[PDB]
Amino acid sequence: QTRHVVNFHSRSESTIENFMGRAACVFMDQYKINGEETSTDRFAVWTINIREMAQLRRKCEMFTYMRFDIEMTMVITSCQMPVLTHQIMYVPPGGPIPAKVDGYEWQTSTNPSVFWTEGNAPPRISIPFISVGNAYSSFYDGWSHFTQDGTYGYTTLNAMGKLYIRHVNRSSPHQITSTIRVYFKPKHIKAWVPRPPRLCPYINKRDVNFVVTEITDSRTSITD
Amino acid sequence: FCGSAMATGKLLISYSPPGASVPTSRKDAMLGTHIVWDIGLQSSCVLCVPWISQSSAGYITCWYQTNIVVPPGAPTSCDVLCFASACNDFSVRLLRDTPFMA
Amino acid sequence: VRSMTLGNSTITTQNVVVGYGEWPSYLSTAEDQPTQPDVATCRFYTLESVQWEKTSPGWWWKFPEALKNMGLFGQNMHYHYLGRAGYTIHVQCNASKFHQGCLLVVCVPEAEMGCADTDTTFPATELTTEDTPHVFTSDSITGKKVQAAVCNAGMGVGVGNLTIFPHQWINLRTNNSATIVIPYINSVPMDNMFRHYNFTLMIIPFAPLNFTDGATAYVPITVTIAPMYAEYNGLRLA
Amino acid sequence: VRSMTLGNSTITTQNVVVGYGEWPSYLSTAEDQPTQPDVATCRFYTLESVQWEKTSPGWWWKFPEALKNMGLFGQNMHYHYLGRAGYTIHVQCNASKFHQGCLLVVCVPEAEMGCADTDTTFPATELTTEDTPHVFTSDSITGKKVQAAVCNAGMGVGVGNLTIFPHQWINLRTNNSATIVIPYINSVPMDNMFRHYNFTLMIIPFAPLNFTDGATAYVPITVTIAPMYAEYNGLRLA
Amino acid sequence: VRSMTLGNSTITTQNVVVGYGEWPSYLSTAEDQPTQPDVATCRFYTLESVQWEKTSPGWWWKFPEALKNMGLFGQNMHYHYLGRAGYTIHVQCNASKFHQGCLLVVCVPEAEMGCADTDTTFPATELTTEDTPHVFTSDSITGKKVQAAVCNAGMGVGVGNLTIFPHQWINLRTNNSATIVIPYINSVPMDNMFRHYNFTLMIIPFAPLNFTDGATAYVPITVTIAPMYAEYNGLRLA
């Protein structure tokens, strides 16, 4: 490459909606169709949070507070029959969860769910700003239980819900193993209180713990 | 300049254009672009470096014009902090993933 | 030289960094009604002076509960379970003319800090010791406590670019005093003052203290907090 | 007869082909600021005269760097890494009245030339020898150098329909002088003057020189370039 | 504190002694025509800093040719054989508050100096070493060089009454900076810049430097010259 005259004047790509509002795959999971009537491998879960993969997690930690609608579009495949129909049930933060693929929670009228049959365009489900407070908090320097009990750093304001996914087909002659890819996207996003970027690598998906990392890459002397 | 309130000296902050070679001596840095920054008068000297873009860059060297002159009470060795931001307005186009995260 | 006074507390001062360009203010409903103390609460609460030697790596205080034993403000924390305030923070250094050094006085809202040996948590008495400050460390440490190494202050960020927050430099060459006004940054209008630490005043020496063999071996840093526009929940019926 | 002068260089001339109907001009930002030399740079740089015999197939010069050793213009190429100019090019021939012939004086922006034996490249000293011209050849050649056969000048096109560019015919029957103005054709407003050859002045004899046994056995072709509206990057701070 | 700038050279300054009450100016004929560079030439040329100890007797520089290797001004001396300039001379000292001393900063036009052992001359490299200063001596010296004893600076006059020239005292008790403007004193409007030394900036410590066993053993004297209103002969034809 060579250093060219990069002559233009634009910061439309540096706004918050043009920086955060990009769809990224945040959840791959397998789920079967038949066998093991009491099993946990016939549906998917994915509690919705921004701390899924470190590339997106890093961008949400530029800012302390942010509020945004989310608009996820699943991309569902299958392996190994009839034409298959799926169900992507979003439960709110206050919502019952299934324990099995044939639980009664799947029939709850307050849990919105899409019934996508195979071959069409991917299913898209949009979720508004659910939180109780006025913004989602990326960081919470505080304790969930009063009087400095356990569970540091986890507030219940930035709870977004869960996403239970199953086949609606009751059975099949052979085994069908479906794969789902959830494409998370912030929408109509506002952000408050900027914050310095992450320096150290991430350890765990529910905490801010880190190993002490060097500031920059080292060089030989101060003058070279 | 984070030294004493009694330490006094001069530093010569030279700037090389993106094509030019670095000054090997203090005189050759004086013949280019520089600012003889008197520490005893002002303690904070501000630059504004243009022609900064990518899609072979400049140099900010610093030289002893004079040594640090110090009374018997104040310490001899001092420190200089540096800062950096966008000078007036900054242009930026094509979003990508950062290299640091693995 | 301006001799400010608030209530029954007078300090002697010598430019204000208003945090995020906003001055603290009150929240302005009969379903939930706030109580505005105004009386007391607003006076100056001078913390214990902190000696800054050549080998001091830094300090941090976690507010609002750093004032949990400070008078009426520390007593209204026990009777009301919701509140908010503004916290004008003066930081003097009263060094001599032959001392040299530089401080970063920054407030860092929502400083969620990391444990020293990850895969576990810390016993909640490692973040705060009410009035007294937890110091940083110069290198890495282990044990069930806060990873208090500078260059990674508490949060895993670079300590140099901690200037994004409401900050003020105290260069002993030029100035000695700092003052920061932090207008209650939070995502809910009122929150409990014992669970949640709204911000973390941390003072970090970038250029280390230096002097010769005749001066005093330290420089006492004096911290003074004035809780402004503190309002609480209502205790009366409607 | 008009005696033009620029700076400290006067030539004697005897219609101008303005390239692409535009006269060179300046670029009109504090983030990037150009420097306009004006002083010197604009004077006439007469290259070495080129003898045109009966068997000469042609010549080419690659600009801007054909002037890389020509005075202040060739010295500002080493101190600034960005620039642009206009290059008024006079081409006299000063033949006699009994000589006959015809030249194509064409400028060809972005003349990317091809290697003589393909599957390889040439050592970069085959495109240009600063001041002196690389001649074409009458037939095909081999070796790691430019395929300089006329009828396929450099680019693999027909040499007859090379008239699409800013050109001028020098028919010794009628005229002797040509002048072309080339207003800096490029896709970026400023570019480095050593990497990129903005255009390729190539002079190609279509009708060959002819004369009898008493005349001089050659006709010297004189090339003169005036870099107009040359501007560079800024070296000062802002 | 005023931060003067000229071209691409900025210094930081802290009253001007205009030499002989006149500010330098241009010479204002087609038989002889001057060229005014204006561009560059006027920037600040900071010489090497000079350490002033307790036993330093003095220094001298001989201008215009002390700047003979200083950039474009030192390069226009080789291309033009006639010229004139003004030379604003800043002299800082940046000592401490516990140092004491006093300097005479005087310019002395036409300082014809005397040989050390009379009946002979000196080899012309004893008057000037371009950028670096020739020091004086505290007593008499012998050999084919300049009689550089103070009390008889160079010219056989008393060194105390050297105040008749454009001068400025630098008393470290009060001030540290000096500035002198010398409007080209000569008997011919233009003269060669290598034969003739128009003036001799000599800095002479009257009261010697003194300090105690803790301070720095020297005080660096910084000399800065800005050639103003420099004009040369013409190189073009008429």
DSSP code for E19: G
- Cβ contact E70–B31 (<8 Å): yes
Q: Who's near C61: CB < 8 A, 6+ residues apart? A: C47, C128, C133, C200, C201, C202, C223
Structure tokens at B36: 């003889």
Q: Who's near D141: CB < 8 A, 6+ residues apart? A: D116, D147, D148, D149
From the candidates A2, A7, A13, which should be mutated to test the interface with B, based on the most B CB atoms within 10 A? A13
Nearest to D8 among E7, E39, E236 (CB): E236
In total, chain B counts a number of residues equal to: 102
In total, chain E counts a number of residues equal to: 238
Q: Does B86 touch chain C (CB under 8 A)?
A: no
Structure tokens at B39: 């520490």
Closest C-alpha to E166, from E226, E224, E87: E87
Q: Does A64 touch chain C (CB under 8 A)?
A: yes
- Name residues 28-47 of chain B within 8 A of D (Cβ): 32-33, 35, 47
User: Tokens 């070296």 — which residue?
Assistant: D235
- Cβ contact E11–B26 (<8 Å): no
Helices (H), D24-159: 71-79
Neighbours, chain B (3 or more CB pairs < 8 A): A, C, D, E
Query: What's the rounded Cα separation, in Å, for the pair E50 and E132?
Result: 9
Query: Which experimental method was this entry solved with?
Result: cryo-EM
DSSP code for E20: G
Three-class DSSP category at D52: strand
Q: Are B69 and E96 in contact (CB under 8 A)?
A: yes
Structure tokens at A26: 């945040």
Query: What's the rounded Cα separation, in Å, for the pair A27 and A184?
Result: 9
Q: How is E157-207 classified by DSSP, letter by letter?
A: S-STT-TTSSEEEEETTT---EEEE-----SSSSB-TTT---EEEEEEESS
Whether there are 3 or more C-beta pairs closer than 8 Å between D and A is yes
Instruction: Report the CATH number at residue E65.
Output: 2.60.120.20
User: What are the CA-CA distances from residue A32 to residues A27, A103, A120, A166 (Å)?
Assistant: 16, 16, 21, 8
Q: Are E73 and E40 in contact (CB under 8 A)?
A: yes
From the candidates C97, C98, C174, which should be mutated to test the interface with B, based on the most B CB atoms within 10 A? C98
Query: What's the rounded Cα separation, in Å, for the pair A207 and D21?
Result: 67
- Cβ contact B101–A55 (<8 Å): yes
Query: What's the rounded Cα separation, in Å, for the pair D119 and D105?
Result: 31
Q: Dmax of chain C from CA atoms? A: 67
**Number of continuous H segments (helices) and E segments (strands) in chain A:** 2, 9
- Name residues 30-89 of chain B within 8 A of A (Cβ): 53-57, 61, 89
Query: What's the rounded Cα separation, in Å, for the pair A190 and A20?
Result: 10
Domain that holds residue E100: 2-235
> How far B34 CA lies from chain D's nearest CA (Å)?
9
- Cβ contact D189–A2 (<8 Å): no
Query: What's the rounded Cα separation, in Å, for the pair A70 and A61?
Result: 17
From the candidates C54, C94, C100, C161, which should be mutated to test the interface with B, based on the most B CB atoms within 10 A? C100
Nearest to E8 among D7, D39, D236 (CB): D236
Look at chain D and report how many structural domains it folds into. Answer: 1
Query: What's the rounded Cα separation, in Å, for the pair A193 and A66?
Result: 9
Q: Who's near C129: CB < 8 A, 6+ residues apart? A: none
Taking an 8 Å Cβ-Cβ cutoff, which residues of chain A contact chain B? 1, 3-6, 8-11, 13-14, 18-19, 22, 54-55, 58, 198, 201, 223
- Cβ contact B50–D31 (<8 Å): yes
- Cβ contact E8–D237 (<8 Å): yes
Q: Who's near D154: CB < 8 A, 6+ residues apart? A: D60, D111, D112, D113, D114, D146, D147, D148, D200, D202
Starting from the edge strand earliest in sequence, which strands make up the sheet with E134-135, in order? Answer: E134-135, E59-63, E199-205, E102-106, E167-171
Q: Who's near E14: CB < 8 A, 6+ residues apart? A: B41, E1, E2, E92, E175, E176, E177
Which amino acid is it at C220?
P
Q: Cis bond leading into C64, ω under 30°?
A: yes
Cα C5 to the chain's mean position, in Å? Answer: 20
> How far C16 CA lies from chain A's nearest CA (Å)?
19
Q: How is E51-90 classified by DSSP, letter by letter?
A: EE-TT---EEEEESGGGTTSHHHHHHHHH-S-EE---EEE
Cα C23 to the chain's mean position, in Å? Answer: 17
Report the run of H or E that residue A56 belongs to, with start and end.
Answer: helix A54-60
- Cβ contact A153–C112 (<8 Å): yes
Query: For chain B, what is the radius of gyration of the CA atoms?
Result: 18
Strand C45-46 to strand C50-52: parallel, antiparallel, or no bridges (unpaired)? Answer: unpaired
Query: What's the rounded Cα separation, in Å, for the pair D108 and D62?
Result: 10
DSSP code for C132: B
Q: Cis bond leading into D205, ω under 30°?
A: no
Nearest to A210 among C152, C160, C185 (CB): C152
From the candidates A60, A141, A151, A208, which should be mutated to test the interface with C, based on the most C CB atoms within 10 A? A141
Query: A179 exposed, middle or buried (CB, 10 Å; 0-12, 13-18, 19+)?
Result: middle
- Cβ contact B19–D81 (<8 Å): yes
Query: For chain A, what is the radius of gyration of the CA atoms?
Result: 22
Torsion angle, alpha carbons of D28, D31, D32, D38, to 10:
60
Which residue is closest to D7 within chain E, CA to CA? E236
Neighbours, chain C (3 or more CB pairs < 8 A): A, B
Q: Which residues pair with E137 in a beta bridge?
A: E149
- Cβ contact B17–D80 (<8 Å): yes
**CATH number listed for the domain at residues A10-223:** 2.60.120.20
Q: Does B27 touch chain E (CB under 8 A)?
A: yes
Neighbours, chain D (3 or more CB pairs < 8 A): A, B, E
Closest C-alpha to C66, from C56, C80, C77: C77
